[PDB]
């Protein structure tokens, strides 16, 4: 047919990569560090969280 047996199964990568992101968005404890690691004034250490 459209072969869900085939390449639809490596499409579980992004399905797994969706669950890969959900942890670090609740692992958001510290913007307070001292080794660059700053989150001093800027919109650089805030982003990609």
Task: Name the residues that contact another protein, by CB under 8 A.
Answer: 5-7, 9-10, 12-13, 15-17, 19-20, 23-24, 27, 33-38, 41-44
Q: For another protein, which is the closer residue by CB, 2 or 15? A: 15
Q: Least distance in Å: CB of 25 to another protein?
A: 12
Closer of 28 and 43 to another protein (Cβ): 43
Tokens of 45: 């250490």
User: CA 16 to CA 45: how far, in whole Å?
Assistant: 25
Task: Give Cα separations from 2 to 14, 30, 36 (angstroms).
Answer: 20, 47, 50
């Amino acid at each position: 047919r459209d072969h869900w047996v085939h390449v639809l199964v490596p499409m579980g990568f992004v399905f797994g990569y969706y669950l890969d992101r959900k942890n670090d968005e609740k692992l958001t404890a510290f913007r307070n560090k001292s080794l660059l690691y700053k989150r001093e004034l800027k919109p650089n250490e805030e982003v990609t969280w």
